[PDB]
């Protein structure tokens with residue numbers, strides 16, 4: 001506890017490595033996002049989709065185009081995340097069918113975690129900061145498509161109140177990926193051993209980075225509960241549309257994950 005020794009040094013090194021890897025794997029960092037969202041960036045201003053009109057001009061059926069755009073991005077997000085996971089010390093030294101498992105059950109949690117970086121009260125940044133689509137507009141979407149992102153915005157405004165930065169999220173995201181309780185893991189003890197290490201790293205990171213804010217570590221770990229709820233409810237809502245809308249197509253790589 002609050003001791004600058006070899007053990008802590010090693011933990012900071014692990015924080016730094018994770019951070020550096022996160023920057024390399026994740027193009028739109030939270031820091032860039034918040035700049036754009038606060039008008040701080042003197043870089044180019046994004047187009048604001050707030051209605052059907054502004055959706056069209058910006059594009060230069062609706063609900064189904066936007067849904068398919070969310071699934072294409074969902075899939076680049078899985079490539080992004082896969083790369084990161086591989087950078088986590090100990091990850092590639094695991095059974096390739098614990099790697100596939102941790103990523104199968106992990107990706108969606110990470111996706112909604114990081115999506116929060118792109119969100120404020122008003123909406124979400126899209127296409128790497130070139131666009132911004134309003135919360136209320138996503139709601140105005142035809143049923144059932146207007147209920148998908150709503151609960152993410154509810155998650156995001158609470159989560160963003162914690163004021164985590166990329167440093168923090170880097171380690172947090174690792175903690176999630178290495179979750180010791182995903183179905184069908186062969187070698188559970190190694191995964192837990194790495195996560196113990198990450199969890200020490202995160203605790204120390206949070207103490208250093210957040211002097212004013214205590215039980216942040218606690219308050220953060222509880223977010224993993226909210227995340228799993230969100231993913232569950234997301235699947236249930238995807239089950240419905242795959243019934244209601246039995247005419248459109250759902251990318252086959254997501255279907256690989258979703259069915260379990």
Ligand SMILES: CCCCCC[C@@H](Sc1nc2ccc(NS(=O)(=O)c3ccc(Cl)cc3Cl)cc2s1)C(=O)O
Pocket residue numbers: 063065066067068069070071073074111115124125126127128145148149150152234
């Ligand atoms: C017209 C293009 C729309 C933007 C496409 C996605 C953006 S960012 C983004 N990325 C994801 C990733 C996942 C989700 N899942 S979700 O919130 O449950 C969701 C909300 C609404 C609809 Cl219609 C479908 C879905 Cl699945 C949403 C998003 S929004 C991008 O940069 O390309």
